[PDB]
Design a protein around this ligand. Structure first.
Ligand SMILES: CC(C)(C)N(Cc1ccccc1)C(=O)COC(=O)c1cc(Br)c([N+](=O)[O-])o1
Ligand SMILES: [Mn+2]
Ligand SMILES: [Mn+2]
Ligand SMILES: [Zn+2]
Ligand SMILES: [Zn+2]
Length: 146
């Protein structure tokens, strides 16, 4: 957009973080984390959270733990949309910042502009044995039935 350009296609060669978050509304308990194609993984447990917050928190962890070039695969359309819109509309007319999750998205943006290249893509969550499926099992354990 303006303060940054996300990549149009995955960065060839760069580590890929399959991120996910899961939360339970009745208890506000959740988990967020990632598995990568270089054999990394991390799961953090969270309190006082929401599904959308956990999806964003997982992106934050991926940005925190990655190098200067990073591929991130999320299944959260919200997470991808609010981050991309923030990048496309900064210091530009017509922009009111969101009324929810604003502090967490600001933390993500501050991590993002530190990077050299970021590819961020949405996949519908799906069944199988791939990356999105693995991190989903990890963050859903004890949080939601699969
Ligand atoms: C995809 C499949 C088919 C293996 N499931 C089962 C499942 C699908 C949809 C909702 C709950 C569980 C998962 O992977 C786990 O669900 C997620 O990951 C998930 C759902 C949604 Br909605 C989001 N999201 O907006 O981040 O993530
Ligand atoms: Mn998810
Ligand atoms: Mn998932
Ligand atoms: Zn609490
Ligand atoms: Zn580089």
């Amino acid at each position: 957009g303006s303060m940054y350009q996300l990549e149009k296609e995955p960065i060839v060669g760069a580590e890929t973080f399959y991120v996910d978050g899961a939360a339970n509304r009745e208890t506000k308990l959740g988990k967020a984390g990632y598995v990568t194609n270089r054999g990394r993984q991390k799961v953090v447990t969270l309190t006082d959270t929401t599904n959308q917050k956990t999806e964003l928190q997982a992106i934050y962890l991926a940005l925190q733990d990655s190098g200067l070039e990073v591929n991130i695969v999320t299944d959260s359309q919200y997470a991808l949309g609010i981050i991309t819109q923030w990048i496309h509309n900064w210091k530009k007319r017509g922009w009111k910042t969101p009324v929810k999750n604003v502090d967490l998205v600001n933390q993500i943006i501050e991590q993002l502009i530190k990077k050299e290249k970021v590819y961020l893509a949405w996949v519908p969550a799906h069944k199988g044995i791939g990356g999105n499926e693995q991190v989903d099992k990890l963050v859903s354990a004890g949080i939601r039935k699969v």
